[PDB]
Amino acid sequence: SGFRKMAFPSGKVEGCMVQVTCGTTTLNGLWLDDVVYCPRHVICTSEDMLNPNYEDLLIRKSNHNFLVQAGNVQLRVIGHSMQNCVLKLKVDTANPKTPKYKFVRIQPGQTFSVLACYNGSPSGVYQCAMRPNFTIKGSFLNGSCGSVGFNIDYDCVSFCYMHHMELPTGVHAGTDLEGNFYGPFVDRQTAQAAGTDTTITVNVLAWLYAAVINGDRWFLNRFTTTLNDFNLVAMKYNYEPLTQDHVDILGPLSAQTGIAVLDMCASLKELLQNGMNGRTILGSALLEDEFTPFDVVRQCSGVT
Amino acid sequence: SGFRKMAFPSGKVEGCMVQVTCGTTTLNGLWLDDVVYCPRHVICTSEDMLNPNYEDLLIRKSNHNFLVQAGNVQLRVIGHSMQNCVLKLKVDTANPKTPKYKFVRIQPGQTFSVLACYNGSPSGVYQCAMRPNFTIKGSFLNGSCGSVGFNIDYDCVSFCYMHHMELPTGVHAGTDLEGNFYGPFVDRQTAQAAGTDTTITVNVLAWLYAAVINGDRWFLNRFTTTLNDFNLVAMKYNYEPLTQDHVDILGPLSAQTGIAVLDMCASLKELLQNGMNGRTILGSALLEDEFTPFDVVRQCSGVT
Ligand SMILES: *[C@@]1(O)C(=O)N(Cc2ccc(OC)c(OC)c2)c2c(C)cc(Br)cc21
Ligand SMILES: *[C@@]1(O)C(=O)N(Cc2ccc(OC)c(OC)c2)c2c(C)cc(Br)cc21
């Protein structure tokens, strides 16, 4: 029992972190097989980042200009190329610590672990979610670029995120491992609007099921609702519309607890319309949306 | 920017997790050098755990009765001994993945990372605190015993906690790595009272400084207080008394932000007497006490 914001064990990812230097800029790289992946803004200077011509800036760089260091061993760069907003540096040695891995593009509302790194060295790991507006509310300082987000399925690391920038609003933006930005963001120091964010409804409901499984039941009520009535409420409180797909993915939690999805929706509707009244759920005084139904199932069953 | 409940990278600890089996009981062990550390209740059956005579139960066991498995390789047990509530199994091979390590007994209010494990396999990592009442509000299921709590200072892993049991109130109890329980707990299925818990005052104030450093300033006020007046308030709201030592440890945060400790105490006093009024601080609607001044400094400076 107990419910925590749990990250994946970061070991398999720690073994991939390297330091990438290009001119005077240093950030983190991801060494998988004989390729080092890092944000392409590593080739920029402060002046360049206003409106950089990446193709032109990369043309002034040769393999020997990219200094890749794994811990304290230098890697020999034999090739370089840009794919969207990432640089792929071919090294002459395959990472002996390369775990089994996939590159996956996550959907908004999905969660992942972040291994924050500085100078190629890991500093901390935390669990977060891709916000519906394609930002992540992480903890990143200058030097953290190239830190990655990932999930782990038994022995396979699915890399989903690479950190590229901080928005003026303190939220974070980045790409998948093919260099495609999540959201409308570009790797420039320009005016960039993070869209309207909403609350991940299916995740809040999954967290309400995690609360019941752990003893926090005060919010359960004598009411039910319909998907349409619940969606009027979710719309009013800037919550994502709940779909039949979301209802279906809550099925195992509904079966374990014996609480129908629509009955749990009526609890959430009452919590939205009335607040917590100075009470807590799983040690939180707000409605938590960074646990998916899969995360709740995994944590509550003990998947390793 | 951004502030997260961050755990240490778990890699160095993942390399130490093994599975320990004794008869029909399986739990986790910690393999450091040629010694495997695990909770001594591994030698018990459900009937034994009412009032077990550990000395007598250990006498019915030989080196060959302790089955230690590291991933999928069997370790040869050449010695066994009990130290307080832990079993130390001498194996014929030193763990090649043994990081630089220390065994430390943490103080109440101090924080640490937990690597939750089942069958010797890591499932997740989270940050938590040793509660003033010597319990931890973790996330542990049956099979998690032997999971460890740790801190990391550059390359050194300081092991502080080993998980032994769940209290009827869903909170967790365990020992340091010498087998000494934190708190009044014993490794028996008996009536065990977790004392009165209080809020870690210095940690809440450290988290208020983390909020100011990150933009959340609404709670700052035009007031100041004295240590004695603040302590009357802390006493009323079941908060730990603030000491001059706590004031001193908040010094670097006081210097960075330019907000005197007693001025921040007056903000906390107003928050305690008036509540949040439906507002949030670092994405939380309650006063967070699981970040020490050292954790805030580390996260806000970028220590790897
Ligand atoms: C990351 O470590 C950086 O290299 N970095 C500098 C930077 C990143 C991105 C952009 O524009 C898209 C600019 O524009 C000038 C600079 C940086 C910063 C500043 C913040 C964080 Br958090 C991580 C990184
Ligand atoms: C841990 O993995 C266990 O082995 N385990 C069983 C258990 C532990 C401790 C005690 O008494 C002190 C008893 O008494 C019967 C059984 C267990 C349990 C039940 C819960 C959690 Br969480 C972890 C572990």
Three-state secondary structure of chain A: CCCCCCECCCHHHHCCEEEEEECCEEEEEEEECCEEEEEHHHHCCCCHHHCCCHHHHHHCCCHHHEEEEECCEEECEEEEEEECCEEEEEECCCCCCCCEEEECCCCCCCEEEEEEEECCEEEEEEEEECCCCCCECCCCCCCCCCCEEEEEECCEEEEEEEEEEECCCCCEEEECCCCCECCCCCCCCCCCCCCCCCECHHHHHHHHHHHHHCCCCCCCCCCCCCHHHHHHHHHHCCECCCCHHHHHHCHHHHHHHCCCHHHHHHHHHHHHHHCCCCCCECCECCCCCCCCHHHHHHHHHCCC
What is the largest distance, in Å, between two alpha-carbon atoms of chain B? 69
**Residues A139, B210: Cα–Cα separation, whole Å:** 12
Cα distances (angstroms) measured from residue A291 to each of A5, A15, A173, B7, B22:
8, 27, 20, 17, 36
Residue of B38, B41, B160, B163 marked catalytic = B41
Question: Over the range B123-155, which residues count as b (16 or more CB within 10 Å of their CB) and which as e?
Answer: bbbbbbbbbbbbbbbbbbbebbbbbbbbbbeee
**Residues A166, A163: Cα–Cα separation, whole Å:** 9
**Residues B56, B49: Cα–Cα separation, whole Å:** 13
Question: Over the range A112-138, which residues count as b (16 or more CB within 10 Å of their CB) and which as e?
Answer: bbbbbbbbbbbbbbbbbbbbbbbbbbb
Write out chain A residues lying below 8 Å of B4, CB-based. Answer: 124, 126, 128, 138-139
Query: Dihedrals φ, ψ of B132, to 5°?
Result: -50, -25
**Residues A152, A154: Cα–Cα separation, whole Å:** 6
Alpha helix segments (H runs only) across chain B:
11-14, 54-59, 201-213, 227-236, 244-249, 251-257, 261-274, 293-301
**Residues B52, B35: Cα–Cα separation, whole Å:** 24
DSSP H or E segment with residue B75: strand B73-75
**Residues B269, B226: Cα–Cα separation, whole Å:** 11
Q: Would the CB atoms of A139 and B172 count as touching at under 8 Å? A: no
Residue whose pair of structure tokens reads 């809020």 in the numeric block: B199
CB B12 within 8 A of CB B77: no
Alpha helix segments (H runs only) across B72-167:
none
| Amino acid letter, A218 | W
DSSP, res B179:
S
Residues contacting residue A125 through CB under 8 Å, at least 6 positions apart: A7, A8, A10, A113, A114, A115, A116, B6, B7, B8, B9, B10, B125
As beta bridge partners, residue B82 has: B87
Would you say domain A198-301 falls under CATH 1.10.1840.10?
A: yes
Question: Over the range A170-182, which residues count as b (16 or more CB within 10 Å of their CB) and which as e?
Answer: bbbbbbbbebebb
Residue whose pair of structure tokens reads 């629509």 in the numeric block: A262
Same fold flag, B1-14+100-197 and B15-99: yes
Cα distances (angstroms) measured from residue A205 to each of A137, A178, A287, A297, B209:
20, 32, 9, 13, 33
* Multiple choice CATH, A15-99, 2.40.10.10, 3.90.870.10, 3.40.50.1370, 1.20.120.1200: 2.40.10.10
Q: What tokens were used for A159? A: 């890399």
CB A208 within 8 A of CB A245: no
- Smallest Cα–Cα separation from A103: which of A180, A178, A7? A178
- Smallest Cα–Cα separation from A179: which of A166, A165, A192, A162? A162
Q: What is the dihedral of CA B198, B139, B37, B92, to 10 degrees?
A: -160
Residues contacting residue B113 through CB under 8 Å, at least 6 positions apart: B7, B8, B10, B125, B126, B127, B128, B149, B150, B151, B152
Selected residues 168-187 of chain B with any CB under 8 Å from a CB in chain A: 170-172
**Residues B7, A69: Cα–Cα separation, whole Å:** 25
The separation between CA A33 and the C-alpha centre of its own chain, rounded to angstroms, equals: 23
For chain A, the structural domain boundaries read: 1-14+100-197, 15-99, 198-301
How many CB atoms are closer than 10 A to CB B221? Answer: 13
Active site (annotated) includes residue B41 = yes
Cα distances (angstroms) measured from residue B171 to each of A303, B131, B180, B193:
21, 10, 18, 11
A302 touches chain B (CB under 8 A): yes
Residue B226 burial class via C-beta count within 10 angstroms: exposed 0-12, middle 13-18, buried 19 and up = exposed
Residue B251 burial class via C-beta count within 10 angstroms: exposed 0-12, middle 13-18, buried 19 and up = exposed
**Residues B25, B41: Cα–Cα separation, whole Å:** 9
CB B252 within 8 A of CB B297: yes
**Residues A2, B194: Cα–Cα separation, whole Å:** 16
Q: How many residues does chain A have?
A: 304
CB A109 within 8 A of CB A132: yes
Q: What tokens were used for A223? A: 């009411």
CB A137 within 8 A of CB A165: no
**Residues A33, A36: Cα–Cα separation, whole Å:** 8
Give, using CA atoms, the residue closest to atom 20 of ligand 1. A142
Residue whose pair of structure tokens reads 């950190």 in the numeric block: A163
Residue B246 CB-half CA count within 13 A: 21
CB A107 within 8 A of CB A182: no
Kindly report the CA angle at A187 between A186 and A190, in degrees rounded to 5? 75
**Residues B304, B301: Cα–Cα separation, whole Å:** 10
- Smallest Cα–Cα separation from B224: which of B264, B180, B169? B264
Closest in B117, B144, B170 to A215, CB measured:
B170
- Smallest Cα–Cα separation from B239: which of B204, B271, B266, B210? B204
Method: X-ray
Resolution, given in Å to one decimal, reads 1.8
Q: Would the CB atoms of B122 and A11 count as touching at under 8 Å? A: yes
DSSP H or E segment with residue B66: strand B66-70
DSSP, res B222:
S
CB B220 within 8 A of CB B259: yes
Tell how far the Cα of A164 is from the centroid of ligand 1, in angstroms: 7
The separation between CA A54 and the C-alpha centre of its own chain, rounded to angstroms, equals: 26
As beta bridge partners, residue B116 has: B124
Write out chain B residues lying below 8 Å of A149, CB-based. Answer: none
Q: What number of helices (H) and strands (E) belong to chain B? A: 8, 13
Residue A115 CB-half CA count within 13 A: 30
How many CB atoms are closer than 10 A to CB A274? Answer: 9
Would you say domain A1-14+100-197 falls under CATH 2.40.10.10?
A: yes
The separation between CA B212 and the C-alpha centre of its own chain, rounded to angstroms, equals: 26
DSSP H or E segment with residue B188: none
Kindly report the CA angle at B154 between B152 and B159, in degrees rounded to 5? 25
How many CB atoms are closer than 10 A to CB B11? Answer: 25
Q: What tokens were used for A240? A: 């994502």
CB B36 within 8 A of CB B20: yes
Selected residues 1-60 of chain B with any CB under 8 Å from a CB in chain A: 1-11, 14-15
Residues contacting residue A142 through CB under 8 Å, at least 6 positions apart: none
